[PDB]
Every structure is written in C-alpha cells, then in structure tokens.
Design a protein around this ligand. Structure first.
Ligand SMILES: *[C@@H]1O[C@H](CO)[C@@H](O[C@@H]2O[C@H](CO)[C@@H](O[C@@H]3O[C@H](CO)[C@@H](O)[C@H](O)[C@@H]3O)[C@H](O)[C@H]2NC(C)=O)[C@H](O)[C@H]1NC(C)=O
Ligand SMILES: *[C@@H]1O[C@H](CO)[C@@H](O[C@@H]2O[C@H](CO)[C@@H](O[C@@H]3O[C@H](CO)[C@@H](O)[C@H](O)[C@@H]3O)[C@H](O)[C@H]2NC(C)=O)[C@H](O)[C@H]1NC(C)=O
Ligand SMILES: *[C@@H]1O[C@H](CO)[C@@H](O[C@@H]2O[C@H](CO)[C@@H](O)[C@H](O)[C@H]2NC(C)=O)[C@H](O)[C@H]1NC(C)=O
Ligand SMILES: *[C@@H]1O[C@H](CO)[C@@H](O[C@@H]2O[C@H](CO)[C@@H](O)[C@H](O)[C@H]2NC(C)=O)[C@H](O)[C@H]1NC(C)=O
Ligand SMILES: *[C@@H]1O[C@H](CO)[C@@H](O)[C@H](O)[C@H]1NC(C)=O
Ligand SMILES: *[C@@H]1O[C@H](CO)[C@@H](O)[C@H](O)[C@H]1NC(C)=O
Ligand SMILES: *[C@@H]1O[C@H](CO)[C@@H](O)[C@H](O)[C@H]1NC(C)=O
Ligand SMILES: *[C@@H]1O[C@H](CO)[C@@H](O)[C@H](O)[C@H]1NC(C)=O
Ligand SMILES: *[C@@H]1O[C@H](CO)[C@@H](O)[C@H](O)[C@H]1NC(C)=O
Ligand SMILES: *[C@@H]1O[C@H](CO)[C@@H](O)[C@H](O)[C@H]1NC(C)=O
Lengths: 136, 418, 417
C-alpha cells in the first residue's frame, strides 16, 4: 500500500514545479481520492487524462487520451484504486510493466463550465501532475 | 442427470485442476500471450490467443495462435483438452480481432484484418478485410475472404468488427457476435432514461444516455452490439447479413458471446459502461437480435473510475472486464462464471455458481493474490455429469511473461463437502 | 577488367577457408548437407539442412537459415560476417528451400509437406509454401503464399522450389522451381537431332520423351521453370508460374538465377543425358528462355550409364550440382568449383574456363576430398573480382559431415606461383 493522493488545489504534495512524483514498485496499491464536499463549500470538478510526457509538458490533450477518471460528484467521495500490475480492467489495456514513466494530469478549469476544457487548465496553473517512475 | 448442489452453501469441492499441456509455452520471456478465447461444442474446442512483443494489446500482436482440439476421457472421471492442430494466423500482424466457433466437430475463426490499428475510429469497413479461417484435426487450414460487398445490413452501419469470446453454428449459418460503428444517433434509451438517479449538473439523462454510447476516442462515433449471420453452400455463394442488437436495455459496444447450451442459445455481453451488472440472456428472436435480459443483482465485475463493482447509475463510463457465463440448470435459473472479487482492481478470480438474485456458492482459484484480466467458461455433460472448463487471462508472474491458464472443475454433487 | 584472361598454369587464387560461419555440431550423428548461398549487394543468405544419421534432404530435422554481411577487415580480402541465424519453424516438414537476398535482407522460399514423396503421389494443393524473411535486427517472420490466387501458363500438377538461389528484380522475386505434370506436352527437336547409336529397345523419339519422366513415377514428368512473385509490401500477393523454354529440354533439376554483371544468369544442374554445362543468360521471361551456351569442356561426374563427358541421349538419372559465376562478359569467362572425377563425387577444383577451353584450375585440397555439389558467387571487392564458394564436404571419415566455405581472388596476372 501507498499513501493515497487527494486530488485538490489544496494539497501540498503537488510541488509548485515538479508536480507530485512517486516511485512505486510493482504490486503496490495507490488510491487517488478526489475530494469530498469541502467544509468551505468550494466545489471541485476535474477530469483526469492518462497522458504522455511530451503533452504533459505542453499541457494539451487531443481526442485520443482516455478520460481516466472524472470528479463528477461533490458529495460522494469518488476514488480510484491502482495496483501496478500489468493487466488492468481499463479500456486500452494500460500495461504498467517496470522501469517506465506514467503521467496523470487534468486540463480542466476548477468548475464544471470548463470540465472538458482540454487546452490548458490545472496542468500549468497549479502544476497538479502526478508522475510515477516505477522502479529505481 | 440433474443431480447436483442447488442451494446456498459453503466450502464447495469443485475438484479444481489446472491444465498446462494445451497452451504452448513461448521461449521468449518478453512475449505476452494475451486475450484468450475458448469455445467448446460437441466434444471439440477451438482456442485462440494473441502473442505480442513487450505489449499485451490485441491488435498490437505479431502472432495469433489458433488451436483445434477435442475433449477426451483418459479414465480420469473428468474432461481433458486434447490438442490436435495448432497453426498461426496468416495475417497475425494485421489482426484487429478474432472470434472462435467450433462447427460440426471442426474449428472456424472469424477475424477482422486491417492495416490501421485505429481503423474503428477513422475508417470504414470497405477499407478493411474480413476472413474465415477453418480447419480440423487432419485438414490443412484454409482462409477465405468474406465478401462484405455482398453483405446486407439492417441499418446504416459504417464499420464493424467480430468482437467476442465465441460464436455459434446453426445449420448452414454461422452467428458471430459483432460490434458495429455508426456515426448518427438512431437509438432510443427507455431503459437508461428510466433510472431514478441523481442527474449530473452538466447534462440531462437523455443526453447522458445518448453520449454514453459514443466511442471514447471519436465523439462522433457510436458503438452498437449485434450479430453477423453467414450462410453458405460448402464455402460457396456466401450470404452475409448484419443485424443489430435490440434497443431494449442498450449498453455500449463491447465483446460478447453466443453459446449453444442446454438446447438454448445464450448471449453474453461484457459490461463496459455504466450498467455494471451481468448482461446476458437467451435468444428469443433473431430479427431484431433480442436476448431476454436477466435481472442479476449479484454478479458484476471490477473497474477503475466512476463505474466500479455494483455500480448502477447511468454515467459516461468506459472500462470493464470480460467474464463469460455458462448455464447449469434452466428450471432453477442457475449459472456459473469465473468473476473477479474486487471492486476496482482485476484480481482474485472466483468460480461462482449463482442465481439471478443470490450467489449460491463460490471458491477462490488461488490462496495468493492473482492478477486476472478476463475469464471465459464453458460447461458440458461428461459421463452424465456436469463439467466445466475455464480460461483465465492471468498475470501471476509480474514482470515475466504472461500466459493464460486453463482450469477444469465439476459442479458439486452434494452441498458442503470438504 | 584487369585480371588473367588467358590459358596459363599455376594460378594464385589466394585461397582461404572460412570455418566460423557454418556452425559445428557436437553430435556426430548430424549430417550438415545441401548448402545454399546467395550474395547480393554486399549481403548473403546461407541455408543448410541438418539430419540424424542421414544426409537426405527431406530426411532432416533442422534447417538452418543464416543472414550476413560482407565486411572489410583491412585484410585486402572479403570476410563473411554472420549476422542472424535461425532454425526453420517447420523444419521437419521441409521438402526444399531456395535463398534470395533482397534489399540487403534474407528471404527463404520453402515447400512444406507431410509426404516426403509428395512429388510422386500428391499435388501442390495438398502442400503449403512459405516465405521466411528476416535481417540483422528484425525477428524472422514467415508468411504463407496464397497459391489459390496463382496463375499458371500450363496444366502443372506439382512444384517445388529447387535450386541454389533466386533473384530480386524491383518488387518481383524470381525463384527457380521444378514442376510436375502428368501429360507429355513437350517437343524434343534438340534431343531428336542427335546422331548417336540407336538403342535396340526404343527409338530416339521415345528415348527423349521418356528421359523427361520422373525416375520414380513413370507417369510423371519433371520440367524446370521459374516463379514470379510481385507484391505490395507483403500485401495482396500476385504469383505467376512460368515454365522453361522447350528448346534444349533437360530433366527437372535444381537450378539457379543470379544477378551478375548487369545480366541475369540461369544455371541448370545436368542430371540427365546431356552431361555438359547447362547455363545461359535470360532473354525472355515468358516463356523462360535462357540463351543456352555451347560449352564443350564443363561436365560433372556420375556413376552408371552417364558418367562425365557423356553426350548421347539415354534414360539416365544422377549427377552433381555445380554453380557457375561469370567473370567477364566480353571475354565469355566463367568460374566454377567442379569435380575432377569421371564417376565419383570427389576432388573439387576451382576452374576458370571459356565456353570452349579451360583457362586455369586449382585443387581445393591436396588430399582426396568428397564433395557432392558446389556453389559459387563472385563480386567486386576493392575494385577486384573475388569469389566465395561453398562445398558440402566430408573431410573427416563419415561422422560429423559439414560444408566448407572458401574465398579466393581471380589472379591479377597469369602464371604466378
Ligand atoms: C434462488 O432464487 C429464489 C427466488 O427465485 C430463492 O427462493 C427462495 O428463497 C428462500 C430464502 O432463502 C428459500 O428458503 C425459505 O426458507 C424458509 C425457512 O423456514 C421457508 O419457510 C420458506 O418457505 C423458504 O423455503 C426458498 O427455499 C427459496 N425458494 C424455493 C422454491 O426453494 C432461492 O432461495 C434462491 N436460491 C437459494 C439457494 O437460496
Ligand atoms: C470521427 O468519426 C467520424 C465518423 O466516421 C469521422 O468522419 C469522417 O471523417 C473523414 C475524415 O476524418 C471525412 O472525410 C471524407 O473523406 C473523403 C475522402 O476524401 C471525402 O470524399 C469526403 O467528402 C470527406 O472529405 C468524412 O466525411 C467523415 N464522415 C464520413 C461519413 O466518412 C471523423 O473523421 C472522425 N474524426 C476523428 C478525429 O477521428
Ligand atoms: C474555465 O473555462 C470555462 C469554459 O467554459 C470558462 O467559462 C467561460 O468563460 C468565458 C470567458 O472567456 C465566458 O465568456 C463564458 O461565458 C464562460 N462560459 C462558457 C460556457 O463558455 C470559465 O470562465 C473558466 N474559468 C473558471 C471556471 O474559473
Ligand atoms: C504416378 O503419377 C500418376 C499421375 O498422377 C499417379 O496416378 C494418379 O494417382 C492419384 C493418386 O493415387 C490419383 O488420384 C489419380 O487419379 C491418378 N491418375 C492421374 C492421371 O493423376 C500415380 O499414382 C503415380 N504413381 C505412384 C504414386 O506410385
Ligand atoms: C450479391 O448481391 C447481388 C445484388 O445485391 C445479388 O444478386 C447476389 O445474389 C448477391 N450474392 C452473390 C454471391 O453475388
Ligand atoms: C454442419 O452440419 C449441419 C448439419 O445439419 C449442416 O446442415 C451444415 O451444412 C454443416 N456445415 C458445413 C457442412 O459447413
Ligand atoms: C424508480 O422508478 C421505478 C419505476 O417508476 C420505481 O419502481 C422505483 O421504485 C423508482 N426508484 C425509487 C428509488 O423509488
Ligand atoms: C428485475 O430484478 C429486480 C431485482 O430484485 C426485481 O425486483 C424485479 O421484479 C425484476 N423485474 C421483473 C420484471 O421480474
Ligand atoms: C576462348 O574461346 C575463343 C573462341 O571461342 C578462342 O578464340 C580463345 O582463344 C579462347 N580463350 C583462350 C584463352 O584461348
Ligand atoms: C526492394 O528494392 C526494390 C528496388 O527497385 C523496390 O522496388 C522494392 O519495393 C524493395 N522492397 C522489397 C520488399 O522488394
């Protein structure tokens, strides 16, 4: 198991320049909790894309990136468990293997108006990118 | 006859045994053998799997194995898979999908071949090719091109692929599960629109349900399940028909299955959208292709994202696992299936004998945690007793080569024996 | 264009044997037999068969396929660099294979059958034919040839790729092939024109018709030919099978096509009554017409009623395969490793010859050496003509039999020792 990663603009683990880097070994669990209804009622709506390093640097996604998980419900604690095995129940396989890099980001504006905005968004404003170099 | 456990019980003795001599063992550790398929009929089976280099994606495969074999008694009081013939698909490097059918004690493989791995997102079926590869224990395999030009369709389909874990032979007609692509919303969704779930603030349920049928990589395309009926005069004068599945309880296009079992025709559809419960049913009519959908409240499948196990409410979701079922008793509405006992991860396969409303009994395959991406199950009468053979797309050795596993087991004669 | 082109003695070929290309089997029961070698554009393809206690072609449990490159080592001579080496996936069912090096890569055209005698009692629809292709980096891939979409110029009942090499011309492959047909559709003006003693049994027209029959199927005839395979980057194959010209017909036998000196050279091993060199450059492709040479000095040994230098028509079968390689087109010069024996397959000799005279020659070994067939390929290296030959040798007595590769240079000056 690993420390779950709460996906909100109010999380310190997202380094202002490097994002959140993780070095998970194969067979590790990792939750990605998207936040519940926060106390101050700041509704947080995102849409996460499994992406490639080049467009993770450029912070742009075309139609081919698959919507890995979307933070639809504000009340329900929506979550996303990951085991770094090879086989995954996701569309497009998503083989993890070992000694690879895996980048997860969101291009969305904070609210639901830009939910499917794929041009810019949080990837560069807050640099909320999860980078997972397995191994080492 | 029908003398077996039909009640809720613990500690079942399936007499589970693994079969290792059927599936070949590749010398290269980097090769991944993935997406196994198995279809049994009249004591003969057809097994198919894909081989790729450092990648377990189906069309990303340089070899596609096609095996034909027979069920044989070895005096063991249990069925054994006897491999008779084994060939590689002549167009393996271009295979997008294949479906096995064992017809008249012979093997038939229906494959979709294309130069473009993304053909389903940006092309049409006139740009691709479709083949029937057929052989048995003695004859050399022969491959014939399907004349899709001479095909008749019940709707304005723009693309299609044979997608599923098995097909069916009825007389001179082959019935293969297929997933079609169409670029206009010609569908209705009374079943999806009738759910009383929280309405998401962006769109309404009619929009949610229309868009949930779209391809996730082409917002302009829709994936609709269906069947293909191919009749012929001894590989002559092919007559091909493409019919869509009923609009009652529509679910996003996904690999399915047709199986001849117990005097019936069973259709299965993998749940890759928001309705995470078992989609299966016996075939009532053929036009439109109407399976009598079950109300299963206990069988689901794991998936990451917004639609995990036991999820019911409509939502724009994509993802899931393929898990065949096999009927055991028509009157008692009993079925067996190797499902994954996890909410979001694909692991811990469990042989599960179930009702439409209750789980009857179950058993883990391995004591240790086991990765399993898909399972298929087929059951049959052997020595007047019900036996089943399942294939699991396993990854027990993480980091090393991937190879599926075959298990044989018996429905328990008595309840609670250990 | 600067080498010895006259009759002379004591030539200096600078002969060297190559041993590191062909593997050496630890098992004494293995027979390494039937070597094939084709060189093109600085790359080569080598093939040979391995069997257990038997050196017969279809009686082989392993078939090696090797791809490699010609490399300069600063040695002032070409060296063979072995790049890839694989075993045929259907080796235990291989009846015959032919190598082609196309675009600096290796291509192997093989015939697979359950019946080692398929050519006597079966047909080609009952068998399968494959192309196995690979290079230095890519894993070998084998594709089945769609013989269903094949067009033929005659009513052939069977065929096998039989020869020491093929040819790549643009997008088309041209492979030598031996066909089987069960009706006498042939004429024999050339054989019938011979002024030889009439055999008391049959007439010359009968002798010449029947000498084309298979020696193991009195009802079948073996006719040489070519196969033209055009394709769209291994897609939508278009395959054509054309027979050889009826001018100067000789019983079906392994042949060769080679790209040399801007021309295409065809060779046919002499396994019938005409024991002299059958070779010629290709004029037309349909029908496959090679301009046959009128060579009066190159033959081959064989036991029985047709030994070396036999000319008269006779129902004969047997002989040895001995490739040739052209050295100068204007001077009509060729080189070949032939067998210096009347009836036994022994004493290989590198021979540079005219169509009418032998120019010079040299024995490969001072000791007696058994050699059943030889193949030779020549090329320009460092602005000089060099040649490489492979001999299926048996230097040790019996036991581990293995072919040998030799490299030599055409002598710059005449009579230097
Ligand atoms: C399979 O589904 C059927 C419904 O389609 C289930 O039906 C009935 O379920 C009850 C509750 O388990 C069974 O037992 C009951 O037990 C009490 C104990 O006193 C008894 O008074 C009731 O009359 C009833 O027998 C009931 O047997 C069963 N129906 C029949 C006809 O047996 C069924 O339970 C599900 N399968 C299993 C194994 O539970
Ligand atoms: C998403 O899927 C749709 C559904 O097929 C795709 O629609 C088709 O897209 C192509 C080009 O992407 C259009 O081009 C056509 O090309 C031919 C050949 O030059 C020309 O004759 C036509 O007039 C047209 O220019 C095509 O019209 C369009 N629709 C159909 C029915 O074919 C769409 O391209 C896909 N988009 C992505 C990004 O994958
Ligand atoms: C995030 O993106 C959304 C995209 O819809 C923005 O909403 C639009 O903002 C523009 C300003 O450029 C307005 O003209 C539009 O009326 C807004 N709505 C739509 C539907 O376009 C939003 O302002 C962005 N910023 C946030 C949400 O903080
Ligand atoms: C020699 O060749 C002839 C010609 O093919 C063979 O005769 C044929 O044999 C096949 C298979 O037995 C039959 O189907 C054909 O009807 C026969 N006739 C013809 C005209 O093809 C003959 O069998 C061969 N001799 C052998 C195998 O010993
Ligand atoms: C193909 O279609 C044509 C016209 O649609 C029809 O006449 C024919 O019977 C069909 N089948 C074949 C094998 O041509
Ligand atoms: C399979 O068997 C059935 C038996 O009724 C027959 O009708 C059908 O034509 C057979 N399929 C063939 C010969 O391809
Ligand atoms: C949803 O609607 C159906 C039919 O109108 C009804 O039977 C069901 O009770 C409803 N759901 C809830 C939670 O009331
Ligand atoms: C469908 O399944 C549910 C599950 O309990 C059941 O309540 C409902 O009656 C079923 N519908 C029909 C028509 O049987
Ligand atoms: C080669 O043959 C020609 C005639 O065919 C002859 O004149 C010439 O002398 C021969 N070559 C040598 C070296 O004798
Ligand atoms: C090989 O080279 C020729 C050169 O003309 C070219 O036409 C052909 O496409 C190349 N590739 C193959 C596979 O022959």
């Amino acid at each position: 198991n690993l420390e779950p990663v709460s996906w909100s603009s109010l999380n310190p683990k997202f380094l202002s320049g490097k994002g959140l880097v993780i070095y998970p070994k194969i067979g590790d669990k990792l939750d990605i909790i998207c936040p519940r209804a926060e106390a101050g009622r700041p509704y947080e709506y995102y849409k996460l894309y499994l992406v490639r390093p080049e467009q993770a640097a450029a912070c742009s996604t075309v139609l081919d990136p698959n919507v890995l998980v979307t933070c639809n419900r504000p009340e329900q604690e929506i979550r996303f468990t990951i085991k770094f095995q090879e086989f995954s129940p996701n569309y497009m396989g998503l083989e993890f293997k070992k000694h690879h890099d895996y980048y997860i980001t969101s291009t969305s504006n904070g609210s639901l108006e830009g939910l499917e905005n794929r041009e810019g968004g949080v990837c560069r404003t807050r640099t909320m990118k999860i980078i997972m170099k397995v191994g080492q | 006859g029908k003398i077996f456990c039909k009640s809720v019980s613990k500690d079942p003795d399936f007499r589970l045994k693994q079969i290792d001599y059927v599936i070949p063992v590749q010398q290269d550790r980097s090769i991944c053998m993935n997406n196994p398929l198995l279809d049994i009929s009249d004591g003969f089976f057809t097994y198919i799997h894909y081989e790729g280099i450092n990648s377990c994606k189906k069309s990303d495969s340089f070899k596609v194995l096609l095996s034909h074999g027979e069920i044989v008694d070895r005096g063991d009081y249990r069925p054994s898979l006897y491999l008779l013939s084994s060939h590689y698909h002549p167009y393996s490097m271009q295979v997008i999908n294949c479906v096995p059918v064992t017809c008249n004690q012979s093997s038939f493989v229906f494959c979709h071949i294309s130069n473009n791995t993304k053909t389903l997102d940006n092309s049409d079926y006139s740009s691709d090719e479709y083949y029937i590869t057929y052989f048995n224990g003695i004859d050399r395999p022969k491959t014939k091109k399907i004349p899709i030009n001479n095909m008749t369709a019940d709707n304005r389909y723009i693309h299609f692929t044979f997608s599923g874990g098995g097909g069916v032979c009825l007389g001179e007609e082959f019935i293969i599960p297929v997933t079609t692509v169409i670029n206009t919303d010609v569908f209705t969704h009374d079943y999806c629109e009738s759910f009383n779930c929280s309405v998401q603030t962006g769109k309404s349920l009619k929009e949610i349900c229309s868009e949930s049928l779209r391809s996730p990589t082409n917002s302009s395309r829709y994936n609709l399940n269906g069947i293909m009926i191919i009749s012929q005069n001894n590989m002559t004068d092919f007559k091909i028909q493409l019919n869509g599945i009923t609009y009652n309880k529509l679910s996003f296009g996904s690999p399915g299955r047709l199986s001849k079992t117990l005097g019936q025709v069973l259709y299965y559809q993998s749940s890759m959208s928001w309705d995470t419960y078992l989609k299966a049913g016996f075939v009532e009519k053929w036009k439109p292709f109407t399976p009598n959908w079950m109300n299963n409240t206990v069988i689901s499948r794991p998936n990451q994202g917004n639609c995990p196990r036991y999820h019911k409410c409509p939502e724009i979701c994509y993802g899931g696992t393929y898990n065949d079922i096999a009927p055991l008793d028509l009157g008692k509405d009993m079925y067996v299936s190797v499902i994954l006992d996890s909410d979001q991860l694909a692991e811990n396969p469990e042989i599960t004998v179930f009702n439409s409303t209750t789980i009857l009994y179950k058993e883990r395959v391995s004591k240790d945690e086991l990765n399993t991406r898909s399972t298929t199950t087929s059951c049959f009468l052997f020595l007047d007793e019900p036996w089943c053979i399942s294939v699991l797309e396993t990854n027990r050795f993480n980091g090393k080569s991937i190879r599926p596993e075959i298990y044989s087991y018996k429905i328990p004669k008595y309840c609670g024996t250990k």
